[PDB]
Enzyme design. Structure first.
Site, short mmCIF file in Angstrom:
data_model
loop_
_atom_site.label_atom_id
_atom_site.label_comp_id
_atom_site.label_asym_id
_atom_site.label_seq_id
_atom_site.Cartn_x
_atom_site.Cartn_y
_atom_site.Cartn_z
N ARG A 110 6.22 2.63 2.34
CA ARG A 110 6.52 4.00 2.72
C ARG A 110 7.95 4.43 2.36
O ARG A 110 8.23 5.64 2.20
CB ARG A 110 6.22 4.18 4.22
CG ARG A 110 6.63 5.51 4.85
CD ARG A 110 6.17 6.73 4.10
NE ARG A 110 7.33 7.61 3.90
CZ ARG A 110 7.56 8.70 4.60
NH1 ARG A 110 6.72 9.07 5.55
NH2 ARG A 110 8.65 9.41 4.37
N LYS A 111 8.84 3.46 2.21
CA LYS A 111 10.24 3.72 1.86
C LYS A 111 10.87 4.76 2.77
O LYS A 111 11.28 5.83 2.31
CB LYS A 111 10.35 4.23 0.42
CG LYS A 111 9.82 3.27 -0.63
CD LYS A 111 10.16 3.77 -2.00
CE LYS A 111 9.70 2.78 -3.02
NZ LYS A 111 8.26 2.49 -2.82
N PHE A 112 10.94 4.44 4.06
CA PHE A 112 11.53 5.36 5.00
C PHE A 112 12.93 5.67 4.56
O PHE A 112 13.64 4.78 4.11
CB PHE A 112 11.53 4.76 6.40
CG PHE A 112 10.17 4.57 6.95
CD1 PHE A 112 9.50 3.38 6.75
CD2 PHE A 112 9.52 5.63 7.58
CE1 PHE A 112 8.18 3.23 7.16
CE2 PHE A 112 8.20 5.51 8.00
CZ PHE A 112 7.52 4.31 7.79
N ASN B 49 15.95 8.82 14.14
CA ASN B 49 15.00 9.51 15.03
C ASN B 49 13.77 10.01 14.27
O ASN B 49 12.64 9.94 14.77
CB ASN B 49 15.69 10.70 15.74
CG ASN B 49 14.82 11.33 16.85
OD1 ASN B 49 14.58 10.72 17.89
ND2 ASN B 49 14.35 12.55 16.62
N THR B 50 13.98 10.52 13.06
CA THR B 50 12.89 11.00 12.26
C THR B 50 12.01 9.85 11.80
O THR B 50 10.79 9.92 11.94
CB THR B 50 13.41 11.79 11.04
OG1 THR B 50 13.87 13.07 11.49
CG2 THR B 50 12.32 11.99 10.00
N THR C 293 0.77 -1.23 0.00
CA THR C 293 0.00 0.00 0.00
C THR C 293 0.80 1.28 0.00
O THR C 293 2.00 1.30 0.26
CB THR C 293 -0.93 0.05 1.21
OG1 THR C 293 -0.15 -0.04 2.41
CG2 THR C 293 -1.94 -1.09 1.18
O1 LIG Z 1 21.57 14.57 6.50
C1 LIG Z 1 20.49 14.74 7.05
C2 LIG Z 1 19.17 15.23 6.27
C3 LIG Z 1 18.09 15.68 7.00
O2 LIG Z 1 17.00 16.10 6.31
N1 LIG Z 1 18.17 15.69 8.51
C4 LIG Z 1 16.99 16.25 9.24
O3 LIG Z 1 17.38 17.33 10.09
C5 LIG Z 1 16.35 17.46 11.07
C6 LIG Z 1 16.83 18.21 12.33
O4 LIG Z 1 17.81 17.44 13.07
P1 LIG Z 1 18.07 17.60 14.65
O5 LIG Z 1 16.78 17.57 15.51
O6 LIG Z 1 18.96 16.38 14.95
O7 LIG Z 1 18.77 18.93 14.86
C7 LIG Z 1 15.55 16.15 11.20
O8 LIG Z 1 14.21 16.37 10.92
C8 LIG Z 1 16.11 15.33 10.09
O9 LIG Z 1 15.35 14.32 9.52
C9 LIG Z 1 19.42 15.21 9.18
O10 LIG Z 1 19.65 15.21 10.39
N2 LIG Z 1 20.51 14.73 8.45
O1 LIG Z 2 11.74 0.06 -7.65
C1 LIG Z 2 10.58 0.20 -7.36
C2 LIG Z 2 10.06 0.11 -5.86
C3 LIG Z 2 8.72 0.24 -5.64
O2 LIG Z 2 8.36 0.19 -4.36
N1 LIG Z 2 7.76 0.45 -6.79
C4 LIG Z 2 6.30 0.63 -6.46
O3 LIG Z 2 5.52 -0.38 -7.07
C5 LIG Z 2 4.25 0.21 -7.31
C6 LIG Z 2 3.43 -0.42 -8.45
O4 LIG Z 2 3.86 0.02 -9.72
P1 LIG Z 2 2.93 -0.05 -11.01
O5 LIG Z 2 1.59 0.66 -10.79
O6 LIG Z 2 3.81 0.66 -12.05
O7 LIG Z 2 2.77 -1.53 -11.40
C7 LIG Z 2 4.18 1.70 -7.05
O8 LIG Z 2 3.35 1.93 -5.93
C8 LIG Z 2 5.61 2.00 -6.74
O9 LIG Z 2 5.91 3.11 -5.92
C9 LIG Z 2 8.30 0.48 -8.15
O10 LIG Z 2 7.62 0.64 -9.16
N2 LIG Z 2 9.67 0.35 -8.41
#
Ligand SMILES: O=c1cc(O)n([C@@H]2O[C@H](COP(=O)(O)O)[C@@H](O)[C@H]2O)c(=O)[nH]1
Ligand SMILES: O=c1cc(O)n([C@@H]2O[C@H](COP(=O)(O)O)[C@@H](O)[C@H]2O)c(=O)[nH]1
Lengths: 267, 267
Positions: B92-94, B99-100, B60
């Protein structure tokens, strides 16, 4: 190697958002971006209200917010931005197909492309992300948007190393009007090729050494002399019992003097 | 090179989620993951209802949903999952500091760590992401969670190349119990080191060639013979006027036979 003042790059930068930002930095004498990452809109808006006058930019993470709403989070933020004069940067770090990011950016629940003056993307996906995000933005707004590319990270173990950093810097060259610069730890050059890349660097702290979960901080003076245009500070301003208002003036001032010092540079 | 059947890896895999998934695949004879990327909960749930019995997993993108709600989106999905017997994978591909990502994963509005059996992260951030997400998960649920690492992408211009692909495969070796495998285009090895990496590959399509915004499709037979365990199909099931119900049986069956064919392999 030292760059032109902010007031100059404002009249030189091709992007209207980068120009405005540079003006804001000059107007208020700040290169401090506040990254108030709190889980409730209530405190977010309280921290913003306090930092408002000392920041040139506000980097947000709305998907961290437990109570986000277009009316209670965005409407108030937009107002604050207009009242204290700073831009909005949603640190969403898009990193998926151009098709997926187009939807995650322009719509969804957050509707980021609608209020965020600036956002960013990982270089991983390829160049099609900059176009996917550009098109997504112009399909929902006539307002100027700016994109930052994540060239380097500040956490322990980052893979944004040389090669990957290169491919990413390459994606930014694709659109000098849209891509404002990079989220990087050091200058990324480009001056030679007619690029006025804006360098915004997170992982900055005068007190904390970092971590807990990978973070690592560099002092304000450290990063600036490395070619940083803007310093992104979060837990260093509001966390550990600190006073956002005091820290705001503190970091803002420490960053501005580290800038005036680098401008006295002549190699 | 050919792998052990799904029924086998189920009693072999260290992870409770990977094991269950392998059982589901065996039970229902499917290695088809449905990626129903629609913007409203209404149709999402209609498409799931239709695919429910032909999929072993539902990937999803809740942040693409214009009307997401825990009650209206998650509760119904969890039921569908339980009724038709498949797992929930929030793509979601974090990709942020540990921490974030900890906050974006366990709370916010989506509260992904509460219902998603599986999720994923980009290797860019470093190993600190696996721990940030692992901890976030165990702080909000006692339920088994599994993490997939994005080794390779399928879109034009992906920077998930050799080196970066390596550093990422490395982050997965850090936790055999939590990291189930990868979102990759090809087998990622590991058997030698006692790893039963699950290979889920998106960008699969029997008809479409792709793009518009960078996408590229490979046939079901193409990817499977490449060592894919599960095939992630989206627009190929519900888009372009297609019938999700018919396409589901179609793809599910074309994937299952390409599997039984690779198991007849002996190098
Ligand atoms: O290289 C990176 C890229 C970022 O966007 N950040 C971002 O910087 C923000 C602020 O960091 P901090 O609270 O540690 O000062 C966080 O929201 C975070 O995701 C980071 O620390 N390192
Ligand atoms: O390398 C990647 C990694 C993915 O998560 N996806 C994901 O797979 C999904 C389905 O793709 P599609 O509708 O083109 O069949 C999308 O939600 C997308 O973000 C991708 O296409 N290539």
């Amino acid at each position: 190697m030292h760059k032109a003042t902010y007031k100059e790059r404002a009249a030189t930068h091709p992007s209207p958002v980068a120009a405005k930002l540079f003006n804001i930095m000059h107007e208020k004498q700040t290169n401090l971006c506040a990254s108030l990452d709190v889980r409730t809109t209530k405190e977010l808006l309280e921290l913003v209200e306090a930092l408002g006058p000392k920041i040139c930019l506000l980097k947000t993470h709305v998907d961290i917010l437990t109570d986000f709403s277009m009316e209670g989070t965005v409407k108030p933020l937009k107002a604050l931005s207009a009242k204290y004069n700073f831009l909005l940067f949603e640190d969403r770090k898009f990193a998926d197909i151009g098709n997926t990011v187009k939807l995650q950016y322009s719509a969804g629940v957050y509707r980021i492309a609608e209020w965020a003056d600036i956002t960013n993307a990982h270089g991983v996906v390829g160049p099609g992300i900059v176009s996917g995000l550009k098109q997504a933005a112009e399909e929902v707004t006539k307002e100027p948007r700016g994109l930052l590319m994540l060239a380097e990270l500040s956490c322990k173990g980052s893979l944004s190393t040389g090669e990957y950093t290169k491919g990413t810097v390459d994606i930014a060259k694709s659109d000098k009007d849209f891509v404002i610069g990079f989220i990087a730890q050091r200058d990324m050059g480009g001056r030679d090729e007619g690029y006025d890349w804006l360098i915004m660097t997170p992982g900055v702290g005068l007190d904390d050494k970092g971590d807990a979960l990978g973070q690592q901080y560099r002092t304000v003076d450290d990063v600036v002399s490395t070619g940083s245009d803007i310093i992104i500070v979060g837990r260093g301003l509001f966390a550990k019992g600190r006073d956002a208002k005091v820290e705001g003036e503190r970091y803002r001032k420490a960053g501005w003097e580290a800038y005036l010092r680098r401008c006295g540079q002549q190699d």
